Design a protein around this nucleic acid. Sequence first.
RNA 1: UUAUUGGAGGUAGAGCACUGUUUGGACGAGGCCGAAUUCAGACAAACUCCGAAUGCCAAUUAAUU
RNA 2: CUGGGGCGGUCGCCUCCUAAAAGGUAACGGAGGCGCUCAAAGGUUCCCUCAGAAUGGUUGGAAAUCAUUCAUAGAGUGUAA
RNA 3: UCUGGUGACUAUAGCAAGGAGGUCACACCUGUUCCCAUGCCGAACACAGAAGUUAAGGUCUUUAGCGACGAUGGUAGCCAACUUACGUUCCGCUAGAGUAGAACGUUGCCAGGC
Lengths: 136, 74, 166, 93, 113
Amino acid sequence: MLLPKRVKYRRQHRPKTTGRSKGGNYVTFGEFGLQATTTSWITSRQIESARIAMTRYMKRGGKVWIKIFPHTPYTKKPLEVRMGAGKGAVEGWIAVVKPGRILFEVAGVSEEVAREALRLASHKLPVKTKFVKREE
Amino acid sequence: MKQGIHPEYHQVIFLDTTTNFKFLSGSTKTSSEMMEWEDGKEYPVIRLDISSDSHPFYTGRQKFAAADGRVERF
Amino acid sequence: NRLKEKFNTEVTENLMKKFNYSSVMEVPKIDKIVVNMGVGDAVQNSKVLDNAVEELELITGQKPLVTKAKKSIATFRLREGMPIGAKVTLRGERMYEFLDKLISVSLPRVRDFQGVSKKAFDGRGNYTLGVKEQLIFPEIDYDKVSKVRGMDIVIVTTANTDEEAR
Amino acid sequence: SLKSIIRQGKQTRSDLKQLRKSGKVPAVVYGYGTKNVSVKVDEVEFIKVIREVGRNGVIELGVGSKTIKVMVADYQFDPLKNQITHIDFLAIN
Amino acid sequence: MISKIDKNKVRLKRHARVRTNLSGTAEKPRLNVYRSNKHIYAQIIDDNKGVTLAQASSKDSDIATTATKVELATKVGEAIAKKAADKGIKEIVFDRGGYLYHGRVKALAEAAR
RNA sequence: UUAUUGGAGGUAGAGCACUGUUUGGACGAGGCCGAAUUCAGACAAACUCCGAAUGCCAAUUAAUU
RNA sequence: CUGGGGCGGUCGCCUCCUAAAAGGUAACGGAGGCGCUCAAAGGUUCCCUCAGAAUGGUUGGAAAUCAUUCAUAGAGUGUAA
RNA sequence: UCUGGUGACUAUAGCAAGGAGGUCACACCUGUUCCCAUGCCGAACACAGAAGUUAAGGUCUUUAGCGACGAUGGUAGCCAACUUACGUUCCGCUAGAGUAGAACGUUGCCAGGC
Ligand SMILES: [Mg+2]
Ligand SMILES: [Mg+2]
Ligand SMILES: [Mg+2]
Ligand SMILES: [Mg+2]
Ligand SMILES: [Mg+2]
Ligand SMILES: [Mg+2]
């Protein structure tokens, strides 16, 4: 449950979900990375449910970050009303991933261990993923 | 020193017990007792100060009081 | 007038051969002497504190104003002070008023001046400025004088106040 | 030590990618003692620039004559195919 | 550690604030002034093609004199170009533009305006 | 309509200098966990130090209908 | 007016965004205001430059005045942008 | 050529550092009787003057460390065409932003004196 503290205006548009990734597709922090390759959303509750499954296989050992902090709100109008009187209230938060940008960076681990643990949290995400390690 | 609105001040002689080393100015006025010429030949009525007789630094005051020091043979 | 010729006979050879300046017109001259006296009352007490400073240096004294009209006391453009510049025939004279001796409780004023090369002071009440009388003044007329020099070293401010007790 | 390229004939069209299917990589040269000549080096020998010094070093190429003592300036590493395109060169003089 | 401000560059920031309202039309030209500490200068410019018309200093050794606000000021104000110069237009960058440098305008209205 | 020149404006893209949102390292700011700044990264319809493709008005411009 | 109608809310002017780099451009799409005020807060001639960040200095708001230094607009413009 | 006055040139020109001098010309100061005036003070504005000083301002010669300008190649977007319901390819023109090669410690008009 990562949230923004302050948001300027609480009801915003939806992002243009086409194109490539902006940047952030080179890993900078860990030795091992997990990037995406298809074009969905992630809804601020995967990103912790891929964090608790990540931590426990490594038993809270080496360093693990995230890279995707959700900024945008998204609204669902309440239970079965007719169309059009104004937008509904927010209910979650979101951050759109393009193809080819890094989600997770991990370090302080051998190769044969962390390549398992990224796979076990790749099934908690609504996206297709692919292992990667420090473009040199 | 635009005209009009200010009170007037001018020199004096401050008759100190040590050389009376003050011929500077001020707003005080009374009867000119002892005029001079080497200083400001003006209202001499600046009476007395304690300027140059015992500074806390550039002089010598009386001694300190008492330590433990039983110099009275109890 | 004699204070100026001691500034033109005594400190000339000293400060140019202790600090070792090259030219002759390099010594720290004394610029303005500002005197600011705040008042704790934003109502009426400053009506009676106008005359106090004018007995010490007869320049009329500006009543300043606030800038911001801050939190829990005052609104904009009141009066809370009285600055007075003292520049040439006064700065050679009010600094020549070396009678802070009336205060007498260890007249040694300060050790640390300020980081930039000025030198601010303090007073408390009817002690200094020996022209005034201790009869008609049932209030602490305490002031805050200053002394700024053309020097750019606080070590130079340490030497230049050789004749005011620290 | 081991590099070669052809002076890439200029004003190429947007069919430049159907020769990137074969393992080439376009590049230009800079430098004190040169003029900007687009070259076409094949990256099959770019498993053999790690195999001399690593990244920071010198290797000559010989585009005709004047094999420049060069250095690898920058990449354009686009992922999802795990390849390199448009590396750049820089003489030392 | 106060550094005393020069009079010169403060008397130049104000200059563009004045010469933004007037310009030498080459038919109704523009005489400016100068002053430093002793000697006051005076040109006259066309601000279209950027040429001068009649330079006349004060320190030009026309005659040695004294009293810099008295007639030594006025002498160049009587120094005049016998040209197509009609009533000209004065630039007044230094203050009191009928009082201070008025020795350059007490005699500029003698014949030159 | 088309070639040529000259122009108006701030989208797609990019970027963090601007108001705002951010996860990491050292940085200070009481008597065992927190209070300004700095380095390396990101996000934006009401964030732009930048900034195209096209369209749009005008050449007393030349070719064609 | 109305994603059928009553119910709720709206009905003219002003400022953005949506609006797709001229102008224009809707929806029960997203945000805010107004139905005045000022004899000087209008006209003219001169002159001056800011909120802050430090650094110390009777009173101490953390911040009511005073100076010094680094401050390109980070302040201000009677009123919302 | 050089010093000064007034122009144009998008800071390529400016700040940041460091060394050099004289005042024939700017300054710094010497004062306030007068011209004028600081909601106060002649520091500033103005006036009267020339014994001092190059430290400062301004001038000149180096330093690319601060900002600023900045090419060739690329990649994203994209008018036109084709194919296709794929967060699409493919072909033909224009072509940035960041980032690197770097250029750069100003240029030039006209006056009066050397
Ligand atoms: Mg001056
Ligand atoms: Mg965008
Ligand atoms: Mg949009
Ligand atoms: Mg209905
Ligand atoms: Mg439009
Ligand atoms: Mg003076």
